[model samples]
Target: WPEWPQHSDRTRRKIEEVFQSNRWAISGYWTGEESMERKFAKAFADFNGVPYCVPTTSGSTALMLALEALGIGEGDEVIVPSLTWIATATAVLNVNALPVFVDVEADTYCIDPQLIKSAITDKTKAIIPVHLFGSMANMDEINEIAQEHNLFVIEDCAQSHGSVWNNQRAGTIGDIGAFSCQQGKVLTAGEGGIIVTKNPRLFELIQQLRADSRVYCDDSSELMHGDMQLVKKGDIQGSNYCLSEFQSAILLDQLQELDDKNAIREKNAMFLNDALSKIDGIKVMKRPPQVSRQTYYGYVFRFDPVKFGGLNADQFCEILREKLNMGTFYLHPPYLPVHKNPLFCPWTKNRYLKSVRKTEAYWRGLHYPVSERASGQSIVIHHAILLAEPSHLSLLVDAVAELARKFC
Candidate 1:
């Protein structure tokens, strides 16, 4: 059950405002004055502190387009974290390339920079670092490694919107960034995605890639009622990954309230952290000193496995829910080591048959020991939509405290 409710009347009013204004999609399929694409572009770029933005139909397409824009294709290998969503790796395969999964640090559920050099080789073309659970990955270290290997860096900002590290936004820290605006995210548009870049060249390329090889420009207004234009050049292969006006408008309105929601989320996370820490055999994950801003997209509680009488995190989740009536606790395990996932075989059957077995071996059992350790021994929870009420937070904290007493 979700603790947080969908955006309130305030959120609906914003969407209705867009609808009432008669501004619709890029194709003029609905209201004709303005499109949500422009609104989303400006809002997203502003949030990430970037100069350009390209919206897409889904977060997976956002990643795929980022890889496409970077010129990644067959015979290339891209490094990804073993701890991220399946799309992180699958996106590489979608571009006819291989995804080599790397281990992550135990403390932060992100790729371990220490493992980057060992994973890189002549075939490596790029690195995809996912800011998992709203925690910013170590970009400085990751970027340094990318530079050493001449690899492109695509920051997977699917979860960490508006997150800051050392005064820099998470998505803006890398050469390129991808985002998912699915309903689950803090700033959701029901269903949408975006890719951002500071590089004007890559920005234009991304626009072309998302628009079926057609780049957005002022010179082509006659084609689509002053919104979208058809592609004239076949220099690069592309697809129809464009976002509709409703999704863009909803996303734009949500962006206006994103920071405020995140602020409340942060406050509630801290309160929960402090309260949970006082319990015996329990501690919350704290961000490293360098991460200037840490958003609590998912709140995790680490418990001493032995102290809990060998009851692992999965068991603890059941106990927590049964006792507290709180859905904040869960023990969702990581996917089978990426190497073992059958989903990875698409590359061999279609893109890279020359090294199928080797690719299979490399992907199999590619486990993130660090993330496994944390996720295994710990119980995780998220701030649901209804968690906005201060009273609700107090009730949750009290429930967790009561649950802790059972361990004693």
Candidate 2:
């Protein structure tokens, strides 16, 4: 497999460029020359076809910023899928709101639109539809529910970079979209995230929310630009969640070739999927009709021991470990449903919100049968494996072929 998170020489040069620059961040903006942070923001905005964007320190902060900018606060609840990273739900608690967890579709591993309605109530202010792994969520159904309920929609595009639905991009379909450029993500600056939207006024509020109540001065504005590019508008109180010039500079270099790299991954995935589909015990994850272009962060395929032999899922995965290198094999255990995830106990650390996130009884009672079932049999492989040479993928196909033959 190609080295994960590999960067180009151009990417190496961008670090030096940002290091030498006087203006390192938008808040500390200087001269008439634009800041790297702003440049990257504009570039990403254009890339997502969104009119406005605000880069943040991390994906969690991006989610927090979006929730706050939309005026979601105390007593409000955000609908989220139970199979995602802890940050998806924790961001809700940080905003003084509750995160109501819903189950994912076993086939798609995305927030099931049908389950979303049952979770909604008068307290529901918005829904965060996560475009998970390689599959884009069913946006059409999610949006219709949001419209009918008059709730806000935040598209979590953290994993599904460059993924498309119909003609619209992942982030553009919802009211606001958040992305993670963390080191492990498809796009990486080591640590960074961004939020995008078409609403100009909301964008301004988001900027203030991330940069200690500061917003950049426009060319037409009367604000002076000595060293500080950002001015305090005092629209709302905020703290520093701003993306550094270093991360932004790196993003500028990588963002250019994102789609090209995504295409290569897709090509390899199509080949792998076809071969795996022919095996009796394997099931390739499915996407809906609207998913036009799927950019995979990771590929997860199902294992059904009954169809092949009496071997347990754990035994099969262990056999795979002997045949596969770490590059092509990842996370044999399915994603832990968020309710039972040990890392997600916000109450244990936070003194103020002892019961804000979830109570012990409430947590234990929450059951997502589909997530549990999928976790028992699912196996994961990162997108970097798909970036490998054709021969590497063939090796993977051969391993599964041999396993199916022996088991059957």
Candidate 3:
């Protein structure tokens, strides 16, 4: 938990081994009979308790692939959390679909299942529940709602690598799960992504789509290490979203230590939460009883200006930094609802104008008081910092308490 992008000797050794073999690409391996990408795909799939995993160039591509596999296309609407990273919404746009932005719950910073229920229409085809800040969304309720509407559920697991809900892993609880191993993530490989699914047919569909409509032939007589046979010639459109062997090698090692590291962070985070609860104007992010585990990518809490004599999160954070020499405790960037972003403007493209107009109107009629309030009040600490000793957590608690008492 010291800092992000933490690496180990195993990460170094595996990467060195890949470089020494002179096969950095996932295709046509000159290195050996096994590709690191395939190994990682299998290992990660096993880790998530899923039947299949397809590695991609990035989490963004993983999301797009999942959507494509689910048959989400033009005019289709996918429900997404407004508080999440833009990728959650942009992936929907990339597939020529509309992303219906929904507000998050104030306590969990996750897509409100009720909001998702209210957003559904004949146009709605899927829902992407983002495990924001490493906490699992209420998948039980989400899945039940999805079933009621016959919509697919694709979990955005970028921030929740090891997070679990009701004994199920974050990504595995949904129809499809997308993960990122980017530099800042709890588990990183510089940049990489994996999509997991329990459905074999869907798995094959995404696998073919990820490899330019190519599928592995049942006959292994002539199949090489990373070979895939062309299926249906051009039935589905795809691109080169393949991940590199080097990144896969790094992830293979990183996965081994993911759970242990997350455990330490979780312990420290819970301690800080309990300690800070006694201080006025502060409330730790809520953990529902259904959540068996939470792997925090960013530890978040709510700060009230009124209780702190009108000192907002920004001011409190500034003073905390000055007093403690720690800059990680800071207000998160304002969670701009994706619909408000210029990229989603209706006038940008003629094809988008009609959809954007309808989306804007729908959004205009909806209220997200919780999402708006939480966006302003939320303060975040990096997940790595939570891996420190409990004493560090005590220091953080004292600093926060001091700020509240002095109204700094």
Candidate 4:
């Protein structure tokens, strides 16, 4: 458990440079220099193999921008997995659209693509397939479903930073990919997000949606004294969801270190995947063969109470935590299903939300069985745990084995 969010010399240098610069927000107007925000956007777009990237204040704002850019609004429905961060659903609510929750695969903990077909209705406008935890959703199938229904696909790539599937990156496979650089993510700058899209029109729309109806102004464009470094396009209406130059400065440096860190995580995950599978009542998540590389935001594996003399995941994890003693360890779900999430009470806010809440697509206490099973049967650890040395990882192994012996 090395200190997480590892930094580099370049990160410090960039921060100092940005601190001294007069421009903090790109909206501060023409600073006679290309903004670091723009620089990070280009680097991220290239990193994700997309043509354009629009940086935003947070991942939640990124989702809001993606939805607004695609023209999804009131009376529209966006298919989302029930198990992701509540923002995935709240973002849809932000646009006055109903979020139709679908269950995720028990094995991968990703939205089950098969369930998407049943959820699609005339109002369905998009599908946001989340690459939950470290495992990628079956995009080949999710994309096929989207094509059949003429729905937009927005990959919720908030977790899977350097993850790859079938030789394509997570965000590149979908029509639009949204990533978060929140402190917990594989790549982080404390707080930030970016949207990537290959579609040029969508790219411009996203850019304008994040800014205030303006696109990035080129050097050739004339900038009067009061001009925002953005040329007013005003084709699409928007508000300020812009990322600060400070966060992007950190992201720019973090982007360079992603692959090396992800490699270490991948190798360690393989070790745990193999070692844990040998313990009774323990089952590691299944990775699709097409997923060439899987990077974890949090490492999760199932702990079957049935095989451990009816020992529940919470009790088991606590025991293991004490045995490890280095850090807090526990059984936890990344999110409570959106339907049951207490923080997700948008219906109480207005009549429109109340009406939408009553729909079968998003009724209160909706049962999404697979998501329940996955969360109930799993124990999770932060991704930094994977970055620990093999000797340290062995400590985790022995801890779990000790619990198995004690319980069984």
Candidate 5:
């Protein structure tokens, strides 16, 4: 099991003050204030190198607002990877747009850009390239594809915070990016999300979308009057995806410590990769040259059953748990060749039965080569700040080396 960092004392103290000083939701007198929200938004935009940032209630809500800001609606199709959390798909439904699930590459465990291009149709409007397990996707390829098709690209950066690809960073590479700050995230604030973009119109639209079409102003006079005026009419409606004042205060404090957390994790990953390289039949997830920075949400491993006596992924994870006292290790379910999934019945082919059949096949099927490759033969162990330590990683490496000793 990986060890995690204890919350900083300063963070706890600030959050305590926030909870005592203000209401939980973005409501009341402080809700309309710009200090806390502006500080958080600026810090987030600076980190992602985007011109705009809008905080929200959760990662899922962030996705919803991103889609809404882009004016995604009925009859539009957004290509997404099926390997991510269901929120990636649920967000599409929130805007009444159809989610076209695609497969991922076997090596990087991210959506295949070429496949994404092929999935595009006359109705296709956007593509979401999710950064899986704290590692960034091939943003250059994805961006190229998006540009060629004139499609919106929203980086579902929920799992990646401060991760870099080609030194550009994850969330900023796309037209817009959305991130979650839930308890499980690298920089968690219990429940919070943010969206960032370079377009001024999109930025202004996001503000209206999240605040019931209400717009905030920089002028103290305007805020004092509580005016909900917008010079431009909304192109699309938005939901109440705003993050709470408490969450904003806490996240501001947490952002200060993000780099520190990333440093420890990167060092641990380097040490483990060096030592684990000596083991046979076990391949650690490789980093591409362009990715100058990486933050491993879960350390990915490939279990070569051919080298180790036909032990399937499930059995391999069981062996680790039994021997090492670590939590269950498992394979990623393959999500490619989505025809293999019963959930993906071609509803377009049957108009009347579309509703009934789509619901029926939603969870059907076991054949996701992309997901299975990552989840099947591959083993994912939790990688937190504590697990980033070489000493803790050493114990994990010994566990794998022990298996190699017995099997190979």
Candidate 6:
């Protein structure tokens, strides 16, 4: 069960205003004109400090659209982290591109830039570094790698709202950033996605792609019958990935509360870090120095079973959750490497074989030790627990401390 409600009375009122104005959908005359979708897009773009924003139906579409805008298609390979939501890899495949798997940093749980060097090939067109679990990937190094290879970089910011790297927000640090406003994210509207970028051309391309190949009108015009009208600017192949005005309205309201809630999570995380540091067998993961801020989707730490009477990570999490009456899970147990997943097999999905040659050998000898280790040792608590009062943090610390001591 969700301990936090995603909506407020204000959300209800704004949605009511949409109906009251008779502009319930963003289409034709109301499309991109005085509509909640445009308001939320501009607001989210401003929030991320980026030049343009395009709202989409979901994060998956946002990612697919980015790949499509970058002209990543068949016969191309895109690098992705092995330890991420399946969508990150699937998005590349959705564009008929091969998703080459890369390992992640042990502590940060983000794509390991060092591993990226070996994964690149002439066909590699882009790198989608996922900002996982509210921590930014090592963008400085990732960007350098991308520059050297002349490859595009797309920051997967779905799990990393408000996260920062080197004083810059997560998504804005890359060529393009994709965000998800799914129900579980820090900011959400039941279901939606936003793409942020500094490049205007790519922005327009994305806008066209999301809205059936039609860009927004330059100015509102009065129709022959005296009704106001908005028009699309250009023609191109596009799809129906545009977000609904209702979701946008809810997202606008959620944006107002994002910073405050993020601050609370940060404070609680700090308190937990300090409290857990003193306990044996429990080691809280430290944010990288370059990570100026973290919008924790899941607070994570490592459990050293050797220090806790040889208890495994799952056992440790079970004890902690039982003690505190809270929810906990293995910090994202290793996902199936995209290359190895049966769904993407040449026989199962011919797109894999069609996209890249020699794919059989592609999966034969691959290894991602860092990702495997991190997944094996990590314990995670959802961000909602961090939203509780500071005193509640003590309960968490006490629970872990008691278990660590007892098991030891």
TM-score of each: 0.87, 0.95, 0.91, 0.94, 0.87, 0.91
lDDT of 3 by residue, 158-220 (tens): 999978788888889889999888888887888999899989888888877877776655654
Superposed by TM-score, candidate 1 places the C-alpha of residue 96 at a distance from the truth, in angstroms, of 1.4
Reference-based lDDT, residue 5, model 2 = 82
Q: Could you tell which candidate, 2 or 4, scores higher by TM-score? A: 2
Number of backbone collisions per candidate? 8, 1, 1, 0, 15, 0
In model 4, the clashing pairs are none
Over all chains combined, what TM-score does candidate 2 have?
0.95
Question: Could you give candidate 2's per-residue lDDT for residues 305-358 as a string of tens digits?
Answer: 687676655666677767876532453556688888878776666643655755
In model 3, which residue pairs have backbone atoms overlapping below 3 Å? 1-384
lDDT of 3 at 252: 92
| lDDT (Cα, 0-100) at 249 in candidate 3 | 93
**Candidate 1, 264-318: lDDT as tens digits:** 7777777777877887877677676777666666666677876666776667677
What is candidate 1's local distance difference test score? 0.73
Minimal lDDT window, size 10, model 1: 328-337
What TM-score does candidate 5 reach? 0.87
Ranking of all candidate structures by their lDDT, best first: 4, 2, 3, 6, 1, 5
lDDT of 2: 0.84
- lDDT, candidate 6, 1-408, per-residue tens: 237546779999989877766666565355323778878888888878788888888888889999999999988999999878878888887888888989888778889999899999999999999987756788889999999999999999998888878778878988889999888788888889989899988988898888777777665443333333334656457877878778888988999889889888888888888888888766777588898778988888787868877766667667777777765432233344555555544434654555453456666456777666665567777778788887777877777777776866
Q: Which lDDT values do the candidates have, in the order given?
A: 0.73, 0.84, 0.79, 0.84, 0.72, 0.79
Q: What is the C-alpha RMSD of each candidate to the true structure, in Å?
A: 3.3, 2.0, 2.8, 2.2, 4.0, 2.9
- Residue-level error in angstroms, candidate 2, position 82: 1.0
